[PDB]
Amino acid sequence: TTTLAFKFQHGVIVAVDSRATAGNYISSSRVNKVIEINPSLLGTMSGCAADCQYWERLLAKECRLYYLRNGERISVSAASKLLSNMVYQYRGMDLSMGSMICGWDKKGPGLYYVDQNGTRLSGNMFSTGSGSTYAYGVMDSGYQPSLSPEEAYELGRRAITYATHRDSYSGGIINMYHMKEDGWVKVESTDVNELLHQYQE
Amino acid sequence: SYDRAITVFSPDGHLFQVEYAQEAVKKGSTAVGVRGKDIVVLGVEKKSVAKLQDERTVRKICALDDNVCMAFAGLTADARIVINRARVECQSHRLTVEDPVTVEYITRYIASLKQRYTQSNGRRPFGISALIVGFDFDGTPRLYQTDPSGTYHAWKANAIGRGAKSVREFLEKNYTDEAIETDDLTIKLVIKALLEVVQSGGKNIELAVMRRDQPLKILNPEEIEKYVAEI
Amino acid sequence: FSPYAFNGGTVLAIAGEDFSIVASDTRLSEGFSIHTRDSPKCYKLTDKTVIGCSGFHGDCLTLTKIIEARLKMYKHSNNKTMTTGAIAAMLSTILYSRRFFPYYVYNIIGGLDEEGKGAVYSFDPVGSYQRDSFKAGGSASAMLQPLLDNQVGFKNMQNVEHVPLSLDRAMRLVKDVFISAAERDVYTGDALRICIVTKEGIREETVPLRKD
Amino acid sequence: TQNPMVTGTSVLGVKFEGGVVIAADMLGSYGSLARFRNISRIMRVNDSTMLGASGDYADFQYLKQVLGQMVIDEELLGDGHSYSPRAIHSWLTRAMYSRRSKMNPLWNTMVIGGYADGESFLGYVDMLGVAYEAPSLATGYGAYLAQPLLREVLEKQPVLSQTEARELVERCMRVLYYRDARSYNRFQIATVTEKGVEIEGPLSAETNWEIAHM
Amino acid sequence: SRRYDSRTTIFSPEGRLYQVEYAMEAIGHAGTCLGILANDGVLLAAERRNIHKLLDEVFFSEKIYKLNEDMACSVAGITSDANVLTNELRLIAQRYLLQYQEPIPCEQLVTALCDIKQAYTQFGGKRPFGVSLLYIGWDKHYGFQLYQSDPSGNYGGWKATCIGNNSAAAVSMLKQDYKEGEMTLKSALALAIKVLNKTMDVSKLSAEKVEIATLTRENGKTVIRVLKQKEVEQLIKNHEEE
Amino acid sequence: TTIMAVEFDGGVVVGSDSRVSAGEAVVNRAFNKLSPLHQHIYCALSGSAADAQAMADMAAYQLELHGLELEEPPLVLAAANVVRNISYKYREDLSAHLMIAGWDRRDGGQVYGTMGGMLTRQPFAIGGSGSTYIYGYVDAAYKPGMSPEECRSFTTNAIALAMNRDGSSGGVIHLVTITAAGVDYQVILGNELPKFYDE
Amino acid sequence: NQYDNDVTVWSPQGRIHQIEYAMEAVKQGSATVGLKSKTHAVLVALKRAQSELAAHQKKILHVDNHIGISIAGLTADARLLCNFMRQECLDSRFVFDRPLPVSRLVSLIGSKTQIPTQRYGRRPYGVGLLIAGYDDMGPHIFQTCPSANYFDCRAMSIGARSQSARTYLERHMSGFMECNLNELVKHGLRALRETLPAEQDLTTKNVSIGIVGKDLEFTIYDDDDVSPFLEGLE
Amino acid sequence: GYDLSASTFSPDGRVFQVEYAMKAVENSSTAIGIRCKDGVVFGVEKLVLSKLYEEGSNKRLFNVDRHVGMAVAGLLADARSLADIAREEASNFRSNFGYNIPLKHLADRVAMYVHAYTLYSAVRPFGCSFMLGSYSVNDGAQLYMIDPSGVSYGYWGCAIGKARQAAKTEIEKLQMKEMTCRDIVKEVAKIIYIVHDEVKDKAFELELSWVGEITKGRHEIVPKDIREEAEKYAKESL
Amino acid sequence: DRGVNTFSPEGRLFQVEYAIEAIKLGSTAIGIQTSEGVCLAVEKRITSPLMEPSSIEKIVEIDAHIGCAMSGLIADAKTLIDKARVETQNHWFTYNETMTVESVTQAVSNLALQFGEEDADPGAMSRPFGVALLFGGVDEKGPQLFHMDPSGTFVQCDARAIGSASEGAQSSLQEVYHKSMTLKEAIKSSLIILKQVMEEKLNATNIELATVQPGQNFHMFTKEELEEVIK
């Protein structure tokens, strides 16, 4: 698994690969590693698929309940804090979940990294999963805060593509989103092999 | 464990215990809250003001947080319990949402706790009514009022305790946009509204204001005296 | 003392435009022996949903009875039969409830969705699931999946018409891949039970496999 | 249990035309020592159900007591409803599975025989909760030594009579005594038909030791 | 059983709690206690009601309890109840010291006992504690302090107060004579004797009928001390001369 | 530890050795392993001393109450069932076998084995660490229709043979004969023990 | 006066007023009829409507594939009991893999509803029930009461003016065993219509039918589905 | 209000609440129990309140154990729960001691449970009286009766219900000690028909059950043929 | 004195009957179900000019497709409202679908008789809820309207009027509602009935109104929208 996220001048880019595995066996090449909590809130998944899917859906439930009760959409920081506290109750029981909470509330764009250990950090850019180190290299070498939308899409597409090329547990399709002030939009779903061949041309 | 139902329905759908709790609020000292443009003022009567009593220990205007404070009427002992509960909730909210609670949010919590005590076994209703003021993150001033039953509304200017009706009648006919124009004027309104019931006008009133962003402030005897001279 | 046992078996589901096939072998094994040659792994849930379960037979029996009870409970409180998708989502939570003493079952749901199209949901033991076009689970799942990718998904083929999968062709594919899995996987054999789910209802079929 | 103490070996089960036959030796083993050589491992549940158990004898006695009370309890009602072979098999399956899920299993492998509504029933229930039914069964060492002989005869003649099934069962017992080191040459043969449950024994198998001179 | 329930913690039709009001009647009949706060200290002065000649003296005092190094209290009303409350204040102070490694501030201690008293008024079906306390303490936040609490769980800080028999009279007498900020422990003690001479209907006061603890600071250490009979006698003498 | 109980027309004969060991050290060389649960019901303890004593005391208490409630001498089967239940319920915690032998007015003299929670009635029973060495001997010497005198001899011989071979057994032989008349104890000291091939 | 407030207070005549007051709740409920033949068991109830713009209240609930019920009295209690019945049936199918015999399920209800009639502070269930089912002993029609008593009957009726239906039921019960499905349903309808006012009549709005037989799972017919049965009534 | 709770004694030392529960058993159908030479016979005058009820509904004769039968009078719901309690006792005894519970012990245990509901205001006394009958070769025939107070006594002949004062005199004139189950079944039936009121409490059914040597120690409903004869000899001789 | 679970001589629970009496003193709420959707209209009943009209919430959103109009003891409703909110979200988490209006109403209706004072556990209600609800939403069966009272009885309605003017409003409802009625007409008719049964002069501030139609989410009417329909 490779997932990344970075904030630039025109919002937040979120990109993931779609490979799931069981040992050396590729169980799926089309798994969805982004949950859509609401129109301006997203969550990435990496680690144990059952843990990620279950806890991120439970966060979505609480976010929806938060909205109904307080009559407003939960902030990115409060949503990430909710998840952080939820998984801290099972610390040490071998949960495996590394996720990013991306959205846009009243304090502009927001990106948080949350993991099963209880780590919770706000930042400008993050990468998780087994192919994260490879993604960091590409992302960091081509990141500029004044990147244009098309340029930001390319960087995201490149970072993930290269991670799938080197990391055995990453691959399939790159799914990318773009968090904007009026909500997120799904950018593309490009097969990483199509991309890689064109990059080598 | 005591599991007797204290609050029950009567023939005409009346909860006697809740109404008895409201009777206790009526014997409480008058408390007035006025929502101004950029300020929030609370004013409680001091009733019997002895000369041997430490003034600072029996204040009826406490702070729940930096942006939220409250004045009550009725059973003082009951008020203390409620205030502590609210304070604990404010720190809980600040720790799980990383933000100062909104005035309405804590008002909702206190109201909910009061309702819970009208439908639970072994307990009686809280015998107090509260006026909650403060400012939310955006800067808008708020003023709420909760009662023993658990119901709560947002107000512009309200009065609780003995003489609440009298003060309400005078506040309606005195609350306008040209009455809360400036901070001074807003404070005068509360003081003038408190002068309609509180006997021996002057040092028989406890005043405290909450300006935007800053912490709760308490007016001193001579500071209140000056205001009284202008009225 | 171990509370699990590997009882073998393979399950396959295929989704078509207006049909769903769920098939499995009927061998029940333990160690190097055969418990019985007549233990099918597909259960009928509703009139348009079938579940294939493989893995530890103890958990397969218990999980199918829990799902059957939850279907009735849902019908009693909602006055309708659970849809294939609602069954999939509920199964996920049931499997995650035992996250620290997990059911050793590989589930594959096959049925029709609300629009009447074939649907297939695959599951891992702790509940992670997704909708697929075709999926193989259990003992010989790694022998069957690649063939399905090439023959159904048309992977790795150039200049090939991607014609929609007919029920007829789907049935021949299922029988073929199970015959090939009976040659290589020791846990797969005896007989093949195929359930076809269409709008007319569910019809079963049984094809003999190698007994050795 | 965690560590079975006294245990019983294989249990045989064969379905026939109008009934079910079940056999088991009368030995309670303590490790490799034949400690209790005259114990019954076959129990009559009700008029149409019989049960043979392998494994921990104490657990088998506990199940017998719990099953016996259930049959008695239901009989007190006298409402015309009685547990069928399938219902007993289902209950046993659930009981074993529940115990296995609490990491405190009942160390037994049981065979259920029965006859109700002109239909014979033969079910297997192990300690893990694994349950199923077949034309013939054999627990423990019988699965590798007796089951193959039973299946061979059922492959050529799916439906056999009471005599044929009885003769086949005796042939398996002889083979079990020869090759199983935890077996004893004193067994019981339980038969369930429309008349009810009949438990005969103690029986013995005629052994041949002609190979010793070879 | 609803039939035998007395219904201790419910309101009356006027929004009153009768058990609390009747617990208060108990107190107004107990022995008089009075507290005066001076610049250099605080004192408690209590009528003794254990007076019979055959009473042995064995104890620190009848009605004055030490709570921790920096505070004491005297109690009015149901003695056995007061024993429950005074033991609880000792536990509360030691809980605080254990947690913060500092003495409990006097108002935090008062408040925490009063929470226990308010709970008996609101839930659980038991009668309240029939006790009013006066508490004297020194802390680093406010220095010399005097509190009163009552069976409602209500409390308030005072310069001078009185509870028990003839409290109303004592209070009007303290309102006449107490000098804000101008009071010394000598002056306070004098006033105590004056007020105690008038609230007690035995004409001659007698140093056997009263108990006086003072609380002072000496070298950064609180000192609580029951006056001995000689000192009280002298104190009485000194009032006679006036 | 070697324990034994034999049935005879009219009652039972219970016997055991008297050695309590702690590794290689004899902590008690004259211990009585025969405990009376009731007037006509006895039990032979084997395994863990603490466990056996704890269970025997428990059973005696339970049987005592039972006896008084029903106003009748308890059955030997009831005593065995009381022991079986305790032994089965705490099978993972306890490590001792309480052999049950006695006499009642319903089924005469009965011998029950309650090892590990399993209950079985036998003509004669042997338990303890020294019982393994006398399995062959009792199988070849036991004959149905043995008289009380013959049962005591049979018991004495068997235990003596086990005591000489087993390191965990030894000392003296405690003997008890239970019948309608009552309970009659007997102790066979070291010098009066049956002698066999000890070379 | 002092004896009709608690369920644990025996009156001087040897009665328990609270249980008698709970039975009044079943008598105020809408009438419902239950009868059986030789192979079938049917339930017919008159659905009440608060107003003209309101939907008729549900009166026939599902319990299992072989068991169905008809309620009268406190609907909240009826739903409570129904849930309990559903669970018991589910448990029986989970443990023994077979339908729970109707008679055994009825005994569980009796025991469950008996408890609250002996404990201080508790109250009896204020709902009467009509249970139709089909097991190995054929079709059954049971009637549960608020005082935990239950009767096995050939036909029964509970609710407002159910005595008239009972009178009709007793007069035509001789030809119930040999009656067919269509025929048996008519008798119930006729008996159900006997408790209705002279003016009012049974239609496809205030009538609900539930049948369970030899080869038929317990099904409920509402409005338009009750047209066939309604067509033919004299 | 001295008669409002079971935990309250009246001025003359009486527990009226328990006595009120006995009034509920007094205004109920009559059941009889007879201890013969080799068994026990139970007979109940089942009152059929409606014609709609199925033949055999509201049985007042229960099987609490293989060798034990129970005949009750009073609140059927209360009696039914007591029967379940009795069944629990018997079952628990067998699991603890390994054999059939003696009738006397079973009766004592159930009576103590019944006695437990007569000391507090939290619960009310049971509104039913019942009989326990059983037969074994080691115990012979035993018959016991328990009421709302919790008192348990052994009998030779017993009657409970509204007509127990009249049925006792009819049971009195009989030589049950030398009689047998086969012969006592006709007398029980006869006696039941005698005490039964015609005008008042119309329409009744006869319930008959027995346990003894004839039934080999198992408690069961008296056979249709034998019951026929008994009922035929009851109507003809009345 | 009787317990809360005491039955009367007419076979009714005293407490539940008294709770139904409490609903008559509440404001008037109107619900109309049409093929276009479901509209809910309740009078705010403002008792003072200083009280903020937006703080009075009589109509709340249970979910996107389910709205709720309460009447009676408003504070008691809050607890039932949260339960309904949690039930739908729980249903979505487990079954990945929306809960039907009937189902939500059923779940909320099950808590109605869950009160006592002897066999209950630490957290049980000591009395029934004193409020009537109106559930309006759209599922697979289309627009739906449900009404639940304090007795736990819930039923589908074409048009329902709860509150103080329940009797008079219901009469106007049946005499002006048909099966072919449109949403626009339903919204107008409800407002016409609300204005006739209100003691105060109906305007755009003293009333609330929400609609739930196929496709559209739960939508509360704004001041502007309200005014348009008031002409």
From Swiss-Prot, chain A:
EC class of the enzyme, as a word: hydrolase
Intrachain S-S bonds: none
Cell compartments where the protein resides: Cytoplasm; Nucleus
Keyword Nucleus: yes
Superkingdom, natural source: Eukaryota
Main location: cytoplasm
UniProt entry keywords in alphabetical sequence: Cytoplasm, Differentiation, Hydrolase, Immunity, Nucleus, Protease, Proteasome, Threonine protease, Zymogen
Oxidoreductase among keywords: no
Molecular function GO labels: endopeptidase activity; threonine-type endopeptidase activity
Subunit structure as annotated in this protein's UniProt entry: The 26S proteasome consists of a 20S proteasome core and two 19S regulatory subunits. The 20S proteasome core is composed of 28 subunits that are arranged in four stacked rings, resulting in a barrel-shaped structure. The two end rings are each formed by seven alpha subunits, and the two central rings are each formed by seven beta subunits. The catalytic chamber with the active sites is on the inside of the barrel. Component of the immunoproteasome, where it displaces the equivalent housekeeping subunit PSMB5.
Protein name stated in the entry: Proteasome subunit beta type-8
Gene: PSMB8
Portion of the full-length sequence here: 73 to 273 of 276
